[PDB]
From Swiss-Prot, chain B:
Reported impact of residue 21 to P: Increased resistance to human covalescent sera neutralization
Source species: Severe acute respiratory syndrome coronavirus 2 (2019-nCoV)
Subunit-structure text: Binds to host ACE2. RBD also interacts with the N-linked glycan on 'Asn-90' of ACE2. Cleavage of S generates a polybasic C-terminal sequence on S1 that binds to host Neuropilin-1 (NRP1) and Neuropilin-2 (NRP2) receptors. Interacts with host integrin alpha-5/beta-1 (ITGA5:ITGB1) and with ACE2 in complex with integrin alpha-5/beta-1 (ITGA5:ITGB1). May interact via cytoplasmic c-terminus with M protein. May interact (via N-terminus) with host bilirubin and biliverdin, thereby preventing antibody binding to the SARS-CoV-2 spike NTD via an allosteric mechanism.
Primary role: Attaches the virion to the cell membrane by interacting with host receptor, initiating the infection. The major receptor is host ACE2. When S2/S2' has been cleaved, binding to the receptor triggers direct fusion at the cell membrane. When S2/S2' has not been cleaved, binding to the receptor results in internalization of the virus by endocytosis using host TFRC and GRM2 and leading to fusion of the virion membrane with the host endosomal membrane. Alternatively, may use NRP1/NRP2 and integrin as entry receptors.
Region annotation (Disordered) ranges: 21-43
Name the UniProt record assigns to this protein: Spike protein S1
Amino acid sequence: EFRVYSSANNCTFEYVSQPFLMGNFKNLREFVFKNIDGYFKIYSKHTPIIVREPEDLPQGFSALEPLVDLPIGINITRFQTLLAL
Amino acid sequence: PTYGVGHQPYRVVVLSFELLHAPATVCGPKKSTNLVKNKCVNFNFNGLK
């Protein structure tokens, strides 16, 4: 079910941090992705949220905790999203 | 092995570590000492000296 690519080349970094980014109530997962001085920083924040009506971001302050500081050092100008059916 | 030590194969490993603009990820060993508090000591932590 690895329909993301078709070829695998020489890779320079690989990580498998087991702890991953995780009844009527739903959840809101906020993430902040950035890349500065080579290091690629990822901040995450998970919070339960009750359904309102126009399905928008809730009003409130919730800081995102620093999660990953992957040292990559590449040029990133485009990104996409990988959702599952 | 019927020969002398002069012309025997010596397994050779060459280390190549060139520094570039990429962030460093592999460094050398970091020695450490025991902590003793309640006295004025020169602390030399990671980035706080």
